[model samples]
Target: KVFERCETARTLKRLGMDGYRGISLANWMCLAKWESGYNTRATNYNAGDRSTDYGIFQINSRYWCNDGKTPGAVNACHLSCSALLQDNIADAVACAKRVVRDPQGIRAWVAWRNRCQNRDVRQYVQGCGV
Candidate 1:
């Protein structure tokens, strides 16, 4: 499912993503905007690492979820990569929360660092009534 800007913001808030790990809803919105454009089924294969980023939050097969194909990958989220593709974002949100538990925090998403970090991300959530 492809969600609109405000819809994604409200949904993430409903999923408890507003302030998880000190990351704000705006930041998550900004990350999603740059990473997947709010599309639940987005996927990107990393040829260099042979791992794929899955779903809206783009949880990776390399270290977060197991896709049964990434060499030497870990299932830290104990989830299948397909689970991240569902229209329901519960699993993706949970795995994303786990990813930030590392020292990198939201830096786990390079897109966030390049696009959302230290930027005027408030615009992503503005008027979303979040």
Candidate 2:
């Protein structure tokens, strides 16, 4: 689906993302896992694709993307949500970075809001040579 735990760690490091925008890579990895298992093709439907979350970050159509099919989407990313579904995730990474910069910070993701904040997520990158 997405990066194996170790591979994800390595890639994030390569992308200069060990600590991006003040959030630790460990928490980033964990949020991705809980959101989409790092699967680029991942999509979470609220109504049979009428609306959904997309990609490794599970960005929501309601605010961050436009699925075209997702009604009344805000599309703050100004991108077709399908682009985030591709296996090549450079776009998703860029978009996710911007999302984190919003006033919500990383709390934009429910996974991070509820499960990652203040939690010890170091195990997510434990053997990856941070």
Candidate 3:
């Protein structure tokens, strides 16, 4: 379920992600690169907070996906955390959209704030007009 980084931008566009909730395609591509390198199997476990980020978008187990290990998990996405680590990104996209609608907007992803927010990311979608 690994996505080719080079083909990710086009794939995202075809998935109709451009201008989704006012988040640009460039930011999405950049976030994907930093968050998971387009790999669906990517996972990050932070022992400091005992929080785990799962899949390409690195959805958090604390709020979006419930792994049960993270006590008091909100499970806002109403799905298992492992669901995001699959070949298909439909569920992931839907969950991410929900996060964006929250108070943080695209800042829901820390990578977006550190690496993409307010940055000139034209290069991310340079040739991909979608």
Candidate 4:
């Protein structure tokens, strides 16, 4: 939760200054808890190929990592990569903020939830512009 808070707070600090707004602190906290339990070192391992997805936000290395080009590719660098992927909570929150700014922010999230929620164990895999 702390990780999410840090990210969200950072995001708000950026967007807030720029006049972009959407998620409330309560919203961020709720989303982060729902997303990854706020575990910065958390990971999801796909045993089939020994591939590992890591960090606070559970970003996939195959998608975000430049295969060692970025920080966190080796060792715990994946965490840095995860941070870089979105780079911060602000970035992550920005995604959601953009969605909210859309003409149908709430509708969009709802549609996203309907499509993705059932595919994951969380049963609420809604996209927040990320």
Please give each candidate's TM-score.
Answer: 0.98, 0.90, 0.92, 0.38
lDDT of 2 at 46: 88
lDDT per model vs. reference: 0.93, 0.82, 0.85, 0.43
Q: How many residue pairs collide in each prediction?
A: 0, 0, 0, 6
Better of 1 and 3 by lDDT: 1
2 or 4, which is superior by lDDT? 2
- True lDDT of residue 95, candidate 2: 80
lDDT at position 24, candidate 4: 44
Query: Of models 3 and 4, which has the larger lDDT?
Result: 3
Would you list the rank order by lDDT, best first? Answer: 1, 3, 2, 4
Best by TM-score: 1
Report the lDDT of model 4 for residue 110: 38
Give the TM-score comparing model 4 with the true structure, all chains together: 0.38
- Candidate 1, 13-80: lDDT as tens digits: 99999899899999999998998999999999999989999999888898999999999999999999
lDDT of 4 by residue, 1-130 (tens): 3454445444444556223454344344344454456654566665654455544444445433333443343322323344533434544443445445656543343323544333332222233222
Global CA lDDT computed for model 4? 0.43
How many residue pairs clash in model 3? Answer: 0
Q: Give candidate 4 regions above 4 Å deviation.
A: 1-28, 67-130
Better of 1 and 2 by TM-score: 1
